[PDB]
């Protein structure tokens, strides 16, 4: 199947800057390449309610990847996206990271 494999998706971290200040000119770093199977939670696509999935962050699951998860940007194929969550090893022979929960959930002020 996968075999010793990269996804292959290269992962890089994107930060506007490393400092207290945020925004402003942005620098890029390649934290590391990592492979993950990411399908956005993006609604189950049962779409029973089909209201969700809203969340601002995107949930990505990357096996045994500390790095990929939040406080690091994730890149796929050099594409850049940022996601938030908390890594988890839901299952698999090897622990595979996952993102739990969402932010800015239902109900708004």
């Amino acid at each position: 199947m996968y075999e010793e494999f990269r996804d292959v998706i290269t992962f890089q971290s994107y930060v506007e800057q490393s400092n207290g200040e945020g925004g402003k000119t942005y620098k890029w770093v390649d934290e590391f390449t990592a492979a993950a199977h990411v399908q956005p939670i993006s609604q189950e696509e049962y779409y029973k309610a089909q209201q969700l999935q809203t969340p601002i962050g995107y949930n990505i699951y990357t096996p045994y990847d500390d790095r990929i998860d939040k406080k690091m940007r994730v890149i796929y194929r050099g594409k850049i996206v940022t996601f938030i969550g908390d890594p988890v090893d839901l299952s698999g022979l090897q622990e595979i990271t996952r993102i739990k929960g969402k932010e800015d959930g239902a109900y708004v002020g």
């Binding site: 199947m1 996968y2 075999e3 010793e4 494999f5 096996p63 090893d89 839901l90 299952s91 698999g92 022979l93 090897q94 622990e95 595979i96």
Partner: protein
Amino acid sequence: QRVKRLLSITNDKHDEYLTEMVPLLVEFAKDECHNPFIDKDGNESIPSGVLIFVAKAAQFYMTNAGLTGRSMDTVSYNFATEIPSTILKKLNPYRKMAR
């Protein structure tokens, strides 16, 4: 799957563990003459009957184990399908159904 995945698989990961486990039962039991099931070198061999059970069980067990690879908290159950009624049915188990 991936080689890494294979490595991740416990059975694959520990050749020794898997390898060792069978012969404990096997070595004494079979004849045992012993029908040597071993080279002079002492390379281990595994019984057919043991092998069938062991392989089937082991293959399932890893699948059951996950993680990847494992049933979801809400998921269909790998367990039911893989676990032999059938293989148990194989060898009968009663066998030569009658005596």
